[PDB]
Amino acid sequence: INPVNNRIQDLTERSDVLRGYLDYDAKKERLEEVNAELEQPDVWNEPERAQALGKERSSLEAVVDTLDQMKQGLEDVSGLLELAVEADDEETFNEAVAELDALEEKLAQLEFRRMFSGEYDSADCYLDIQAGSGGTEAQDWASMLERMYLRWAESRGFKTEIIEESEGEVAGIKSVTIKISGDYAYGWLRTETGVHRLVRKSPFDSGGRRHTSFSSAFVYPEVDDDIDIEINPADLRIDVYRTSGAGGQHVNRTESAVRITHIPTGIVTQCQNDRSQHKNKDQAMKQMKAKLYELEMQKKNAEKQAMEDNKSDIGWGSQIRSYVLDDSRIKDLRTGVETRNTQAVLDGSLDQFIEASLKAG
Amino acid sequence: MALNLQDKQAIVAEVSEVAKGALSAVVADSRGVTVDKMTELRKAGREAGVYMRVVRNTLLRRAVEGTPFECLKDAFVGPTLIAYSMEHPGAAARLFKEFAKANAKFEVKAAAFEGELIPASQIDRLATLPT
């Protein structure tokens, strides 16, 4: 028919998922309820509420006001060339060409919303893939799931770097660590944390029967340059006193010992090893430098442990995709995308398993 | 003002506006209101011309020094703030009346209103407008 007009029905294909997910009718209808909330004289007495809302109304704009104009252009961009192809108006033929860029850039305005989820989207990330027990079949599938994403990362233009590796005793691997390098590395693979599921007839067992083996693929950026010891002497109360006393008249007179008490925290750091106050100062400053940074490593782990506590209670909800190769069927159990193209999946056909997975997530 | 160069420039420009104009209509209106200065300064550029500028440099040795060539009775308009206004585009035309309508439009004051010329003298309120 027309590659120009079918492209419009393909922008429609990208639009309808966003129409159904965020509910652009109810997402629109939410705005008029908060217009009357904001249109009020007694909203000045809660300025924090209005400041939280004054941009919240604008957050609803770029979602609704983009889609509200987007539905109008579907008939408009298609109907422009439809009248231009009849009269063969070559200028009007070229007029609808820029019209194809009208809604697509608006769709790109929603692409901001697609990548809005995240604070390290453009950061480089790691691809850590651990294998389940499963005998050797799970060892092989970790390798089969390695090259699943290793073929895909190079299929899109991302730099693939293999940092760590651990091979199988018989065949396959055990736990490989790939570092995907480039911009938007962690952004696309953010929806890849979670266990993957394989169902196939295992070739490793002699009487080969259908094994249901699993593999997990946890990703994380691990990119930082900010380390704060907070050795600022506005803190760190210094207390100097004299030792126990074994060296006669001298050590009982010299205030050699020293204590380092942190002002915000309260941990004390004493040192009375050497004989000079100048020498015990640097050692007590060193031990305080250790005990303060090691307190920071526990608060890093405390927030990390509470982060896992929202993940350990999930259980059988950490499964991502079901690769049932006995009947040649793929099941993304999160969203509900079924595909019958397992030979093409291993090439890295997961673009269908991202557009459905990431925008809805 | 720096010195004589800028000072005489205020004089010389006013000097050229005496020789060809005839009327002497004055006001001591302190309130140069935003709209009123967009009215009385528009009216000259709507009726007469852009010769009429604000100047209340009324000092007996300053503005009189700007007019020692014609109508030396302008000297006795030497005291306190007063806006001089001649009339070139039609000698002694109706610049006075509509300007006095501003007095009926709440122009604050006009100290010792006299209709200075075209009697060639004082108090006469200029009923006759030779247009």
């Binding site: 009357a36 904001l38 249109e39 004289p41 909203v43 | 528009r42 000259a44 550029g45 852009v50």
Partner: protein
Amino acid sequence: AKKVQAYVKLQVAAGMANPSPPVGPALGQQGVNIMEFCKAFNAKTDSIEKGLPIPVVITVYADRSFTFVTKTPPAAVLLKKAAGIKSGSGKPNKDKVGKISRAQLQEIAQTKAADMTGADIEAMTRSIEGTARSMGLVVED
């Protein structure tokens, strides 16, 4: 008794309609009738233009009655409709705009002076030429 004491100059975007949600509580400082202005807002745009920001001048007299004074649209948006550009200043050596012809600027000059006053309107014609130059927009003959 009151004529001009509750003076306001407002009216962000005239291209849309129904001022009640965004600017409704602005006239709600004194309790002004929202629809009487909403109709007057819409009885102002439909006659002239309904697609760009135009400013209004309102003053509410005694019994909560107000008079209207429409104002000419600002050159920042009037030359955003004339030149039709989404560029602007802030970056003279990074993002400047193309030129505007003099007569097209004169067409604006006819419209600006028709909604304003002044001694010499041709003098105010050059004043806009400096404004567009400060917006990163070149203007020529």
